[PDB]
Enzyme design. Structure first.
Site, PDB file in Angstrom:
ATOM      1  CG  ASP A   1      -2.171  -0.825   1.147  1.00 16.06           C
ATOM      2  OD1 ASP A   1      -2.661  -1.042   0.013  1.00 16.06           O
ATOM      3  OD2 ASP A   1      -2.678  -1.253   2.206  1.00 16.06           O
TER       4      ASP A   1
ATOM      5  CD  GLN B   1      -0.309   5.927 -14.860  1.00 12.22           C
ATOM      6  OE1 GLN B   1      -1.312   6.575 -14.535  1.00 12.22           O
ATOM      7  NE2 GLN B   1       0.453   6.294 -15.892  1.00 12.22           N
TER       8      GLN B   1
ATOM      9  CB  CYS C   1      -0.533  -4.759 -12.315  1.00 14.75           C
ATOM     10  SG  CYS C   1      -0.279  -3.378 -13.475  1.00 14.75           S
ATOM     11  CB  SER C   2      -5.271  -3.306 -12.100  1.00 16.98           C
ATOM     12  OG  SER C   2      -4.522  -2.106 -11.977  1.00 16.98           O
ATOM     13  CB  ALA C   3      -4.165  -0.104 -15.747  1.00 17.78           C
TER      14      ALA C   3
ATOM     15  CB  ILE D   1       0.637   1.232 -17.294  1.00 19.92           C
ATOM     16  CG1 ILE D   1      -0.616   1.762 -16.544  1.00 19.92           C
ATOM     17  CG2 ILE D   1       0.353   0.980 -18.785  1.00 19.92           C
ATOM     18  CD1 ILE D   1      -1.125   3.123 -17.022  1.00 19.92           C
ATOM     19  N   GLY D   2       1.292   0.366 -14.196  1.00 20.61           N
ATOM     20  CA  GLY D   2       1.862   0.793 -12.919  1.00 20.61           C
ATOM     21  C   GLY D   2       2.820  -0.192 -12.291  1.00 20.61           C
ATOM     22  NE  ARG D   3      -0.887  -2.894  -8.034  1.00 19.41           N
ATOM     23  CZ  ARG D   3      -1.717  -3.485  -7.188  1.00 19.41           C
ATOM     24  NH1 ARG D   3      -1.634  -4.792  -6.969  1.00 19.41           N
ATOM     25  NH2 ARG D   3      -2.626  -2.776  -6.539  1.00 19.41           N
TER      26      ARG D   3
END
Ligand SMILES: N=C(N)Nc1cc(C2CCNCC2)cc(C(F)(F)F)c1
Length: 291
Positions: free
Chosen positions: A189, A268, A224-226, A228-230
């Site tokens: 987190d 991100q 990950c989810s999108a 791009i981030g993780r």
């Protein structure tokens, strides 16, 4: 002018500069917010028609590096589409990774067609267990399932503190393949330095597994989810580990720019950018401890 910035942006970091840089939000923020996101102009896609294949309307695959699904299906006009891009690796080597969004109910079959088409030997899934069935669905069977005439079997589940490793067999016709599925459950987190060791350990375990594939290792899917981030964090860490080990320096800025050229928005947030620096600073310390 974003393309030219991404081609030339560089900040070579030596060991001492790296440890300080990871703990420098003043320098990190100024550097991060100067990098263009290179998001795809929505005019490149039929946004209204792709709503069931895209998790987010503004996160689209850059057309030049888009993973096209070549397996025929004349009935479905969207069978060739997946929100995924080929990602260059260390020294700009082509197709080292595939960054894609976490599969959704309507894209589970598309995801497995990509796994087969690409001969993917390793999948890296970056989550939290509380995000399951929301940020990413359970696209693998408990034991066995068939998708597009492809028999997918989970042969073994290896539980570790920060990831669950699944040994998967894939079968279609006369062909039989193996796959390593790493489900990382310790994405934090708060991206503090004490949370960097599980990410670095996963990156290094994946690298050792890729070495075992021999030369010409097929694309490693990271999601990950999108996507791009993780995903950006994992891949930047993977590339920069090889750079530090082989050149004795890291260039996180140049790596981030190479990632953004391949897929818009890779890494991100500035917290994610600093997290990569924390992971690299830790890797340098690990290297110094064996030197
Ligand atoms: N270069 C590829 N096509 N795959 C690929 C190869 C490697 C090996 C690692 C050992 N040195 C030689 C390259 C590592 C990775 C990764 F770190 F991402 F896991 C991906």
């Amino acid at each position: 002018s974003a393309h030219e910035y991404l081609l030339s942006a560089s900040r070579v970091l030596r060991a001492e500069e790296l440890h300080e840089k990871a703990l420098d939000p003043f320098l990190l923020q100024a550097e991060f917010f100067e990098i263009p996101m290179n998001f795809v102009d929505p005019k490149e896609y039929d946004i209204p028609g792709l709503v069931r294949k895209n998790r987010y309307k503004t996160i689209l695959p850059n057309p030049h590096s888009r993973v096209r699904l070549t397996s025929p299906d004349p009935e479905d006009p969207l069978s060739s589409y997946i929100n995924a891009n080929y990602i260059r690796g260390y020294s700009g080597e082509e197709k080292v990774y595939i960054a894609t969004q976490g599969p959704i109910v309507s894209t589970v079959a598309d995801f497995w067609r990509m796994v087969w088409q690409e001969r993917t030997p390793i999948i890296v899934m970056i989550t939290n267990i509380e995000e399951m069935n929301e940020k990413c669905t359970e696209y693998w069977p408990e034991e066995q399932v068939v998708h597009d005439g492809v028999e997918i079997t989970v042969q073994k589940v290896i539980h570790t503190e920060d990831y669950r490793l699944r040994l998967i067999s894939l079968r279609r016709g006369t062909e039989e393949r193996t796959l390593k599925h790493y489900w990382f459950t310790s994405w934090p987190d708060q991206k503090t330095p004490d949370r960097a060791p599980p990410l670095l350990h996963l990156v290094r375990e994946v690298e050792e597994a890729a070495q075992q594939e021999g030369p010409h290792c097929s694309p490693i899917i990271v999601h990950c989810s999108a996507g791009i981030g993780r995903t950006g964090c994992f891949i930047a860490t993977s590339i920069c580990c090889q750079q530090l080990r082989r050149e004795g320096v890291v260039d996180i800025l140049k790596t981030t720019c190479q990632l953004r050229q391949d897929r818009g928005g890779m890494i991100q947030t500035c917290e994610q950018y600093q997290f990569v620096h924390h992971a690299m600073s830790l890797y340098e310390k690990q290297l110094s401890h064996q030197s």
